[PDB]
Structure formats: structure tokens, C-alpha cells
Ligand binder design. Sequence first.
Ligand SMILES: [Mg+2]
Ligand SMILES: [Zn+2]
Ligand SMILES: [Zn+2]
Ligand SMILES: [Zn+2]
Lengths: 49, 48, 72, 102, 247, 75, 1345
Amino acid sequence: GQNMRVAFMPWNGYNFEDSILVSERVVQEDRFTTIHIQELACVSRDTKL
Amino acid sequence: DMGIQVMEEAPDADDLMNTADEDAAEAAAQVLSSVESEIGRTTDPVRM
Amino acid sequence: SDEADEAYSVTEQLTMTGINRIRQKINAHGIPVYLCEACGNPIPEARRKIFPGVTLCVECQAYQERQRKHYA
Amino acid sequence: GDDEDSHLGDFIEDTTLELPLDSATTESLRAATHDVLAGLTAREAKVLRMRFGIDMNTDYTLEEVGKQFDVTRERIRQIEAKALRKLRHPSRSEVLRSFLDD
Amino acid sequence: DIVLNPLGVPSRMNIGQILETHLGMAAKGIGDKINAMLKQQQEVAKLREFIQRAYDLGADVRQKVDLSTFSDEEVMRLAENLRKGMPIATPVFDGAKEAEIKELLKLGDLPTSGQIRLYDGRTGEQFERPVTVGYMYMLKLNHLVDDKMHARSTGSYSLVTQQPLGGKAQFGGQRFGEMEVWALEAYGAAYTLQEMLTVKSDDVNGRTKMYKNIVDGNHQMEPGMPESFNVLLKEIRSLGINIELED
Amino acid sequence: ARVTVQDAVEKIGNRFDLVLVAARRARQMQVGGKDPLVPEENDKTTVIALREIEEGLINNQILDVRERQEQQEQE
Amino acid sequence: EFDAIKIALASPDMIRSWSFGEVKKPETINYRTFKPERDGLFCARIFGPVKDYECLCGKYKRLKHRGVICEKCGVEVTQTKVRRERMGHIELASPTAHIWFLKSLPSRIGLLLDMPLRDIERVLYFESYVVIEGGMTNLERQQILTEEQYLDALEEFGDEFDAKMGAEAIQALLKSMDLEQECEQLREELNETNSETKRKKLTKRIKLLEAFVQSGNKPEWMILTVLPVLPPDLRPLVPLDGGRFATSDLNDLYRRVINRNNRLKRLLDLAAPDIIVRNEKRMLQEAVDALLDNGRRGRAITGSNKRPLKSLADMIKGKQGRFRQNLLGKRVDYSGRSVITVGPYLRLHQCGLPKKMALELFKPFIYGKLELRGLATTIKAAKKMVEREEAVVWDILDEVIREHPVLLNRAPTLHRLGIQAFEPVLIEGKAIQLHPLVCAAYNADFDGDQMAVHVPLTLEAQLEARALMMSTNNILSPANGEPIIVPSQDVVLGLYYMTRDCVNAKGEGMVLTGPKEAERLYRSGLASLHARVKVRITEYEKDANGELVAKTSLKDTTVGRAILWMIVPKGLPYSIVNQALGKKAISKMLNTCYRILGLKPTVIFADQIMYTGFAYAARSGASVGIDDMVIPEKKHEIISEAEAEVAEIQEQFQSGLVTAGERYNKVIDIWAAANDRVSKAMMDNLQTETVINRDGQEEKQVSFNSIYMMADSGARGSAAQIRQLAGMRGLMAKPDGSIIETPITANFREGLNVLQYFISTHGARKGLADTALKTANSGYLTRRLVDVAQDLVVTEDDCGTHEGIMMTPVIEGGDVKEPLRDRVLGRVTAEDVLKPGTADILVPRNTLLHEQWCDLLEENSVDAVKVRSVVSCDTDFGVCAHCYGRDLARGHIINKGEAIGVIAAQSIGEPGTQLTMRTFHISSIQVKNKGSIKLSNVKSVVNSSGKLVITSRNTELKLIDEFGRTKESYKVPYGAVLAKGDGEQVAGGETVANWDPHTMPVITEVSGFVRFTDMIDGQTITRQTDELTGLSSLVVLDSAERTAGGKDLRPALKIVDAQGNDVLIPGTDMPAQYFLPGKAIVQLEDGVQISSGDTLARIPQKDITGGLPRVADLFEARRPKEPAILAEISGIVSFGKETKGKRRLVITPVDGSDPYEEMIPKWRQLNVFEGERVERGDVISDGPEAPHDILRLRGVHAVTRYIVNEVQDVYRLQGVKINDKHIEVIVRQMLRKATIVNAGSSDFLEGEQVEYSRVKIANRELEANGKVGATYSRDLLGITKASLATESFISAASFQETTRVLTEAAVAGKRDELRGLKENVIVGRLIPAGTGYAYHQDRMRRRAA
Ligand SMILES: [Mg+2]
Ligand SMILES: [Zn+2]
Ligand SMILES: [Zn+2]
Ligand SMILES: [Zn+2]
């Protein structure tokens, strides 16, 4: 994970039930930007034609 | 087919859920009482 | 809610209605009986002092509980 | 062996159906072609329809068309070519050629 | 950096998060002191002194380390690794009890009670009732939304039961089940249900007619017959059973 | 944008007919060539039909009467 | 379009009409050029072509030939959609028994011929022979034979003797039989001769026979001659990738049948020895029988995959057939799912919707709009524009979105608020931001729960969503009118923190010109949010007729209350916000606003509550810290003293003064008490511990410990969880329910060590496991309950009846468990409510008892009202609106068309999720309230002691005060020595009844001579003498000890008078000789006259379950084998024969026929005196009373009151709130079969069971006619039995056994009329319930016209 400076307090219903109000520094600093490598295939078959 | 379902163990202990009604009950009891009167089989073409 | 939030209440009902029957087997009334209702032995003063309202000597109670333990 | 216990026969798409966008296109194509023919002389319009199968039964050879108008098939070829040349120009062909999305 | 709801603390009896928050604020306070000393560069002397104090700090610990056997450049690589914040171990049922957490929060100049007074970022007026702010370790579970979010307006259709298929992971229409059918039946929503069972899913002429109507600015519908039903007719009729629709 | 149909269910009576009347009325202004009776404020035909239903100038008998009269102008 | 659907047999003729040509060869395709091979299982010329408007020749590839059939290869140039509707027949070489009518149990060929299943199974597999018109010689028609006797009797006869075998024989039988012949013959020989099993089975048979005659069937169509084949596209042979085709088993099965059919044909051509052709016939029969229903009888043929391959039934029947999954629940277009987030900025009638989701679900809308506005020439150009996502595409999107509400739905749709509809606010993001207040309904939370958005296409759909399903239209729980919009956790805590008060805050004491000045101070910074203050508020009230009259004043409030006052609408008092506003107060605030200002101001006000709540909970800064979980300081003492207690008990155990189990019990007891004591210490330390001082010394106020605030505002938490944070976390239980003996004496603020944590693990994982199972079996109750009550609909405005039930306050054990204002609210009064002195007709007789009328009821102190019930309505096939009440989900009244059955099943299955899944358990009559006596069902005697001893049985005492309403309930036991009398004056402190449970009197009415009449000492008496008192007791023993000298004699203790003649008891011709039961403490022996009701003879000597399964059994209506035996008829009781176990008890009327015997098993202690003239519907055995008995004796209203009370108590012990209409409608759906007490003028068998509406319509038609109709006997079935018997077959075959229902409806020619809700969903037409009610009505009047 990443240890971030969290404050426990309600702050405006933006964490109503379980939600989590993340700040923009979390998204600028790229401390959750995570790389996913995906594999796409393309096969050439032998149609009857 | 008429009830009651033959599971292989103890359960139904605390499962209080009756789709086994009702004309099938006496007919299936008749068929069971008859199965002893015969010995089979009339169900495998190969053996017959 | 969630898994843990309902699991808490399931466990909590479990624990509460498990405490309560073990606590209801306890005698809270008062009626000294002095004679074990199965064998007539005199229930000693001390064993009537702990559980007031106990109507069996310790021997007959051990017997009856040993019998209970197999659901007979 | 998935969650629903759905079998194999439920993951086979139907590669023959036409997507509703495509049918809703060629309905629009029928609209556009009928519109374009409307802005044509009745001779050229009837020859264009009768030449292809546009909004009728069977398309016809040139000779049947000349039959319909008492002309040789060469007259009919002249009519068809003139109508086609007329339609090729935009202001009757902008939306039409846009149907050729490429 | 991240505002969490307090109300999920006492319901769910996980006080581990609050104590980890306190200890994390403590550790980042030690890291802050080390970083200000190592940024305003004093020397190895004061720096080694402060790290040595923050490294003893406890009850009968098992972690006696002494920066007397180090280099003076082997303390600088260390105390630079401790500038973002000085880690802290806490074996599972052998953790750091609250006495030590107060001690470490006092090592740095943080408030002992673990709570700060934040000010509001939008009005700038201080939140009364001082708040807990610390350093918590947030994971990022890979239930990522963009593998969750999908839509479908129209697409492929299954081959026997002419229903929406997708299959490209995933253009599948929603599994409008049976309990949803009852949710619509408890309403008077009879048209919503009817189009949700005939023109949206099965009826192979109703669905093209519906697409054409929508693109032509008319929201009517030709209900037709669900394909599941006439397949059912064909199968019941494939036994020795005759089942017709009388008029 | 209209939020509740309290006064609509009030005026028309039944609430399953507040649906049907409003739907046919809106259909007249989407399919047919009608003009909405109330001033439309970037409103959809559904909400417009509900708004007419709510003031009490469109409902079952009125729409039936207008269809009759229109077919009587068919002459 | 169409109407009812007819199912029936199909002749070979009809099958040959269905087809388009016969399938002769078993080959499918051509394996190199995969054209479907002629003319086999996939034949181009039989089952249509393979390409749209192209024949298989290749010669005809244009539409211009569309309709000509290529003379080269026969195919018909058409659409390959046609390859899905054609069928083909297979000419069977020998007949074949349709396995459905053969082995359905009961075998229809069996009991159409009255031939045993074994005999037909012999003739079918050729192990036997059967005669058919065996000439005029020796053998009856149905006579079985064998090889041997056959060849024998053939020597007798070559002709006039017809004994076939196999399906040919069964067919020649089925066709040779005459339905009218045997049916009228059974008529004759059942009329002139009647015997019980005889009339039973024979009238069953004649029912079947005349059913077959009434249908269009023919008796031999059960035996296939031509066999149909499914169309190819329904059993395709699709080419997968890699030349590896995929098919369905039906091709394999059809190959297997066609192969053996052809082989049989060739055998018949070759004239083979009949052994081989016999084996071939049997092989073909097994093939057809495995094609129809594989696995039915003979160990199903397994495919190549080892697997039992599916057949037509398995494509129909079972959990996987058509009727279940694709016929009820399908994947649907214009739909998406994603993750919901909070979005508090919203209103509660909108929902965020990502631009990606919105642009994708709404494609055709954008396409049409872009080509309407001219922004795109064609539709193709519009698709290109959108897939490029230009700047005007977004604006056109927001133009389209505007009033089109989208439906939001969640995964476990537990009730009807699981589907709502909102207006979409486009949201530049990827999560469906769902408004906060709605998560209560959806049961949603924001830890990953995905929601699914559906788009409604048509205009009727948008008007349904906006009028029937909008999220602003359902603010009331449909289970009960209480709103489902209650603010949950951030907002109740913010509102709570606002409306509170310190004892000395900033700005205290000052007086304010109004709420605006309150906010002007608070935001300025001059007053704390809770600093008490005098402010001038002007609150309105709607006292007059719609006149909101204002009244102003200087109220004593805080800054927070007055700041919150600006969001309250007009007609609400200031007292609503001058309290501390937990969750209950912040819920009843919304509730009162609904009851006063209607619905619009309540939705606006609820949004305002949410906004102000979030805002001030943010401003509060209310966090939680580890210093907030304050441990008490008297904790270590309490734990130490409990440890000393357990050490002393263990020491006593070591000294043999206690058992093991009792040491354990005492240990658990002292630990429970120490746990409670620590909980109390901590809560006392924590609730008031804010100790402040104003203008001086000190004063303790309620605490501000944020953990306490969240627990005391109802925001989150309770006593127990903080007990686990600060106090000790108690005794933890292992999963069997047996509690561990050592408790975790710690909290979570201090750690648990390894052992205590390992101990909490047990119960924790048990609870986790039982919620992971409780969820997967979630909608089993609701689903089981909508099967029974689906087709029920409010179908009339008023049925005009005066039946009903007597709603009453519930008072059980002690005081009230729920007022009458609840149980009467919004139900229609059946008959007039008069005042106490009755004074005038107060409440008219068709008044919707809304909140004004509930007030006007409690303002006259009524405690019984005759309210119309659903179960005692009169309309057939529905329910009139008035005899149901008011739709508590909408407030106003039920409408003609609400499918109240479905919403009842849902309103019982949803709160069934808040009930635990596993099942679940639990001296004198002293007055405690102020009131006055009233004894009910009283027949007592005032003995010589001046006291009272009641000789009745049902005598119990209720408390009636100055107003007259019932105050308290108590039971007056038999011989309960009453110090009072009856109805006189009483106060709390005078014990009304003292009675000893050791003794149950035989209380005399006369202070007369004892007399032992019919009391034989030694044969009817036991010579007891207690030498403690030295007590001469001629006790009577039971009939289990004494000899046959006085065996069935009766020991009679009687009070005669003081000269020697028998004192007759006043009223009948019997002196008061109380015949003695056994075991009696008859202390006084003869020659001692005593008081009027002494205990001459003295008889010697409330668990409640709570599971949801207790509810399932409460509805299934099982007869518990400990059932109280009521009295079949009022009148003089009497006993009879003894010592059988089944002992005789009979009751004789004054007037009717006496002799009714009943055999009471002597295991049960009898509870009625020998000669007490008993009431009707009494109790003799006591315990469980079977509901069937309650119906048959006390009536319908008594059984409905019983079942409603049972279910309501199971839901009330946990506090779940549910109305009564729901249990009543389900109970009405329970008792809907009746059987006749007299076959009467009608057309009904005596013991035949028909739907009660059928009886009640025919009898109304008859007593409107000349005769008088059936005398019915109402019956009661469980839900699982009533939902089996239903009218449709498309409906009741979806969820029942498919084969049995289909076969019965086939033999009986039962044409289903689509008038239910399961059918009209299957077929795909409008349901008759809601909006579709109007369409179904006007189409029902189109026809019949
Ligand atoms: Mg969740
Ligand atoms: Zn003993
Ligand atoms: Zn051809
Ligand atoms: Zn009625």
C-alpha cells in the first residue's frame, strides 16, 4: 500500500456509509497509479472460404 | 417421487423447508408394495 | 451493511441466548427442602446455602446430570 | 463450471442477424433513395426504379423496360445513363454518398 | 491526504486502525524531526543522538540497536532512509502498548493525545472537537471500477435463445432476474416490465422495430411475442402434445 | 423536470390512469401533430402531459372528447 | 392478438399437419461441404433453407425468385428464420407408448383402462400378452396372459380370440374402449352399490373418464404413431472454431430413434423371426422414451461425454428447462452496471450517471436527436459523430437525458424499493453516484456494491417510472407507513451534535430576534452551536380548516435548534426540534411532517435535513481517538471480586458440595453478573463525565465523548459494542451454543492475548458462516410466498359487506404490547363505532381510519373495532379496495389494480431478513395498575369463606379504568381464591386472586354433606393415609392401577344436604356429584359436610420460538402432535370407556344428535370435569392448538387472528414492524379450498375439494335461482400446498413439476385463460395487475361483446 495522512472525521457526507474522500495530491503524486499489462490476441483461422 | 427424499445422512435436522402431493402417494405406494410381488425387471432391454 | 456487521449480531444473539439458559438453570427462588426429592437424604446446610432452593442432594444431582448427558 | 452453471450453448452469438443499427440504416437508405428519385423527371425516375429493383418486385432487363415505354433497349440505356449522371452530382448526392461511409 | 469516516470505528470493533493511526503519526513525526535535522544539516552528532534516543524508547524491548558501531556515512544513508518516516515493528499479540505510543508521540513534538486541530480548507474556520490525524497504510484492492463499469445499448445475441450475449467481456445485458420482475409487479409497472421482457431481451422483431422507432423520434412499441415462449411452444409441441393459441 | 405526481394522482383519481392518460397525451405530442396546452419550458412530452394533467385541463374524458370531435371534423 | 392457450393430445393427423415433410435418414450434414444433407435431421427442403432467400442448389440467389421452390433440389427460397418454425414427422414402424402418459405416476394409460402399471409394463416390453375382444369364448377384455396360456387357448381357438402384445395391444385396447360405455357403467354400479374405498376410487375414475369425454381427446392418442421432430435451429449443429462442431443432444437422440425406426422397417420387410423384431421394437421404444424424457425410467442413455444427455422434458422441465431461467429472468438490453458512490450534493430524485454509461445506454436516442437537429446528415454519420464524441454530442446527450428517468436496481431485490427510478444527472466519472437517503431502501453501502441501471424506452414506461417508481414517490416503507427515508449515520450525528447544549458555552444566555440571528451569530463565531439561549420563533399550526395560523413566542432553546429551525416547513411545532434529536426523533420528525404537510414538503424537508446534517457534522469535527474509549477504574475491582467468587465455587466443588454442571453454571452466572456490572460502571463513567461549571462551581452534563455521542445519537453503536471497547468483552460462546467457562476480561482498547483472541474466533466464525449462508438462502420465504399469493389483485372498489374482525389492543402477560392506534390505522371500519354510552353513531361505517380518526378514536377510549379484512372480503378473484384498507406505501387508498399479493409476500420476506435464520427460544394475582375488575367467562361459587372460587374454565380478569378501555390482562385460574368479587372497585395493592398451584379444586356449589356415591374403596378408591398429619384419605386412583371391580365405575364426590338427600346442582337433573378423576387429593372422607366450594377433591399438578423458520412453519400449517383437542359441539360433557389409550369422551346436545365420540390418548392430562356441559370450540388437551381445528371450530376469523398473532409475535420479539394486511392476504390465500357439508343442489361430489370462490359463486347463482346451494366446509392448506393447486397450467407448470402438470392438462384438454401474473409474463403480454389492468379490462369487454 501507501501510508497516507488520514483524518478521521465525517467531512460533508462524501464518506457517508463506507466511502473515502481522497485528496488530489494522492492522484498527482501517483502513489496509486498502477500498471496493468494486458494481452490481446488475433488469430488467422482457415475459413471454409 | 412421492416423498420422502432419501438423502445419504442425518440432515433435514433443522431444515423445515411438501411438493409430494397427492395422488402420486397412493399410486407409488401401490407400485412399491407390488415390487416385492415380482422380482423385476422389465426395464433393461438388453437383459430381457 | 456488511459481512462483519451482521455476523456480529448473529454471534451476539448466539452468546446472549446461550448465557440466558445456563443462567436460568440457576435457582434464584427460596424454598428450603431439606430432603433430596429422589433419595430423601438430608441436603447439608452448605449445599443449600450456595444454591438456595435446591431440591436434590449432590449425589442425586450428579446421577441425574449423568443421565441427562446422553439425552435419555 | 461457472457460477450460473450455464452451459456452452449459451455463449454462441448469432453471426447471421443484422445489427439493429444496420437495418435502421437501410430503412433510412430507402428513405434517401426515394427522396432522390422524387427530384427527378418521371421518365428517369421510373427507369431508375424499374432498372434496379428499387421499391418493387423483380428488377428488369433493358428490353422489358423498352417494352414498358415502347423503345429499344438502347433508348433505355441512354435514359439510365442520363439519370445516373444527374444523380452523381452533389445536391442530390451528398447524403447519398455519405451512405458510403469510408 | 485521505478523510475517513469515524462512525465505522465503533460499530466495527476494529480499534486497530485508530492505534495504527496514532503510531503512524508518531513514526512520521520522528521522520519529520530526522528530516529537518538532515536537511538543515547539523552533523552526524546531533543526528546520531536523536536517532539513538528514538531507537531505545520503550519497555524491555528486544531491539537494542546502537549507532556506536556505525560509520558516520553509514549513519547518513540510514538517517536519510528514515527521513520519509521511521518504520516501526509491532508483532501480532506483542505490540506497542499505548504507553509507548504516547512516548513516541512525545519524542516528536506531536500532541500526546493523538489528536490535532484541523482547520477547514474551504472556510478556514477550525473544526471544533479536535480530530485524529495520523498515517494509515492504505492498500488499493484491485476491484478497480473500470473493470466494473459496463453498459450495453445493443449488441450480439445468443444463437438459440435470441437474448443479449456480449461475450466480449462484456456486452451482456443485465441479468434482469425474477425478483426484479416481482419488484415491477408490486408496482403497476406493467409497460416497463413488458418492454423489459419482450422488446429489450427476446422479441426479434420488436427489438428492431424499437430501435427504428427510437431513431425515428417515436417511442412506441410493437410488443410481438417473446422468442422464449414460441420456442417453448415448439418444444411442447415436439412431444405428443398439441398446444395452440386459441383466439 | 417534475419531481412528484401528488397533485396529478389527486386530479385524475387513480394513479394507474395518471400513467395511461399522461402517456397517451404525450403520444399525441410525439407521434401526432398536437400542440402542448401549457407553456413548455424545455420540457419533455411526458412531463408536459403530466403538467397538463395536473392543472386539470387534460384527462380521460377530455381526450376522448377531442378524439371524437376530431373525427367529426374528418368530414 | 390472441387469447387463451389450449393444450391437449395431438393425433397423428395433427402431427402430420404440423410437419413439412418426413425425416427418413439419420444423417445431419455432409462433412466436407457442410450443406445440410437431404433428407435427414437437418434437411434443407423440409426445415427451410440455410441462407436468406437462397436455395441449396445455388441456382436461385436473388429475391426475384423469392417463393419458388428449386426444381433441382426442392428447397423453398425464403428466410432462414423459417428454419426455426418448421417441423417434421417420423413415421414410426410400430406404435410407441408415450412415456409421459405411461410413467407419470399415476399412469394415465393405467387408470384410463383400470389396468395395473405392472401389467401394461409387461405387455409393452413383450413379457406378456393381453386379450382384446377375446371372442365369445373364455376371457374378459382386459385379461392378461403369457406365451404359454396363449399358445394353449389358441389350440382351443384360432379365431374369436384376439391377444396382442406390445404397443399394438395397448393401442387396440385404448381405441376399443368406449368412454361413455364404461363411464355410465361405473355410474350404474356406483349408484346401486356404494362402498368407501369403492366410491372413492370409482368416482375418481369416472371423473377422469368424463374428463376425457369432455375434452376433444381420443383414448389412444397416448400411443405415438407419428413422431414429431423439433426444428433444426432449436437443436442446431453450430460450427465452432477449428472445425469442431457443437450440437445439442437432441440430434443424437433423433439419430438414435431414426436408426432403430429404419432398422425395424427393414426387419419388417425381411419377415424376420419375431425374436429379433421384438428386440428391435423394444430398442425403438427405449429410444423414443429417452428422447421424450431421458432418465425417466430406464437408467438414461449417456452421451459421448459420459453424461446423461438432455431430452425435450429437460429443455422444458426442472430448474434448467425453459420455464425457469430464460422464461422468467433474461439478460436485457439498454442496461449497465457499475459501482455506486455517495454524491451528497444531489436531490433525492436524481442519480449521477457517468458520461460513458449515459452515452452508451442512450445510443438510439442520441442518433435520432442528432439527425433531427440536423447535426448529422444520415444515421451512419451520427454513429461516426458519437464514436468520435464531439463537443455537440455531449450537449445532445444532456438534451436527451433531461426528463428520461433511469431505473436503478440492486442485486438481491429483497423488496419493491430495490427498484427505483431517478433522473440522471450526468457525471463526469465512472461511478453511479447514488443519493444517500436511498441506501436505506436499496440496502446499499459504498464498499463496492454494484448497481445496475436500466433505461425505460417507451412513453408508457417513462410514465410508469416517473409516476409509479420515482424515488420521490416512495418515501414510505410498503411494509408499514413509517418512512424508509430516515437519515442514517453521518447526518443523525451531525443533527445530534447541533441540537444539544453545553452547560456553559460561548454566547450563552443572550436572547435573539429569531433563527436568522442565530445563524448570524454562529457563523460569525460569537455563540457555540449548543449554548442555550432565548430566541423568538413563530411556529405555525393547521388547527383550522386549512388555515395555517401562526403563533409566536420566546422559546428557550439553543443556537443549534434555532439554526435548524430554518429548514423545518411551516406546519410543525417547535417542540419537534427542541429535543436532542437522536435517530428516533429525527425519524419521527419526518413521520409527523408526512402526516401533516403531505409528501412534497416531506421530500424537500428530508433533503434539507440531510444537507444541514452533513454540513454540521463536518463542522463538528467529531473524530474518534484511542483516548475516547475510557475504561472505568472500578473495573479491576469487579473482575477481582468475580475471580474470588469463581475461586470459592471451585473450592466448594473440590469439597464435594456441588456437582460439575452446577459449578459451571455458577461460574457462568457470576461472570455474566460481573460483565453487567462492568458495563454499568463504564456507561456511568462515560455518559455524564463531561463535568463543567458555569458562573461558579461545577455541574455534570451528558458527555461529549465522541464514542458516546455516536452511540447515544443512534448514529452507530450501542451499549454492547462500547461494552466491548471499554468494558470487558464478556463470555464468548462456542458454535454449539455451549458457552466457554472463562471469559475474555479485556477489551479491544487493551489487547486480547493469544488465548482470548483464539476464543473469540469461535463465535466470530460461526456468525460469519451463518451470514454467508443466510444470504444465499435469502428470497426463499418471499419467493415461496409470492407463488401462493401472486395472482391476487385489488379488483373492485367496494364489495359491500359487513363482515370483518374485531381489532383490539394486544395485551399479553402484563400490559400492552401494542396500542389499537397501530392495528386499526388505515383499515376500513366494518360496522359503526358508537361511543361508550353509545350516545350517537360516531364513526360512520366506511371511513378510512387515518390519523385524525385514530385520534378521534383514542379520544373516546375504544378498544375494539370491527374493521374489514381482506380475508373476509366478498369479491371473487380479487379484493375490493375498501375491505383491504389503504396502500401504506402510497398513503391515500388502494387502487383498482394493485397486485397486493406480490407486495404482501415481499413485505413479509423483506423483514424476514432481519429475523435470525436458525430457530430460537426463550405467585398470586396482584394488582399493579389503577382500574376496576372484569371477569370474563366466569361461573364461580362464593364459598363459606367469603372468597371466590370460579367453577368455569375460560375465566380471566381484565382491568377497566375510568374511560372503559382495557388496562391489563390476567388469567384467573380454576379455584383462584378471589379476595374480590367481580367488576367492583379495586386499587393497586390488593391481590385479587391468591391460588395454590399445588391444588386445582373440585369446588362445590353447596356447603353440604360430603357423600362418596359410586366410590368403591379398593376397587375405585386407594386407601391413602399420610401419617404426618395422620390423614384419612380415600384418594381416587386413575384407571391404570385399580381392579375390574369398579373399573369404568365413577368415584363420585357429591355435596348433598344435611339430612341425606342429594343436593341437585341448580339448573339440571343432576345433583352435584362431581365424579372423580384419578390421582385426586380427596382429603375429607364422608360424614363431614363443608362449605360451598371447598377443595374436597384437589387435582394435583410461555416458551416462544423466534426464527424465520418458525414463520415458515407458521405458514405451512403443520399439525403439532401435542394438539389441544377442542370440543366438537357445545353441550353436556361425559366420558366413556377407559384404558385403551384412546379413551372415550362424548358430548350430548340438548337438541341435536349426541353421540359424537372422541378418543383422547391417555398420555395427556384431561382438563374438563366429567359432567360439565362444555362450550363449542373448547380445549381439553392443552398446548399447541392446530390451526385447522381453530378454523373448523371457531371460524375463519379465529384462525386469521391466531395466525396473525403468531407471525406478529415472531416479528415483534425482535422489533421488526409489519402490518396486518400482509399476513391477512397470505392467510386468505391459505384458506381458499373448501369441501361441501352437503352435495346440495349443485354439481359437486360430496368430499371433492373446489376453490371456495367456485362454491360461493355457484351458491349465489343458485339461491338467486330456485334451489338452495351447497353447504360448504371451509378448509385450510399451507402455502406450499395451496400454491400447488392453482388454475392455470402455464403458471403452475413454470414452478411445479412440469411433466405432471403438462400431462394432466393434456389429458384434460385444459385451455388456460391468461388472467394471472405468471402466465402473462411467460407468454409476454401485459400483466393484469398494474397499468395493464385497464388494458385487460377493456380487452375483456371487447370480447363478451
Ligand atoms: Mg457491500
Ligand atoms: Zn439424592
Ligand atoms: Zn435448388
Ligand atoms: Zn370486501
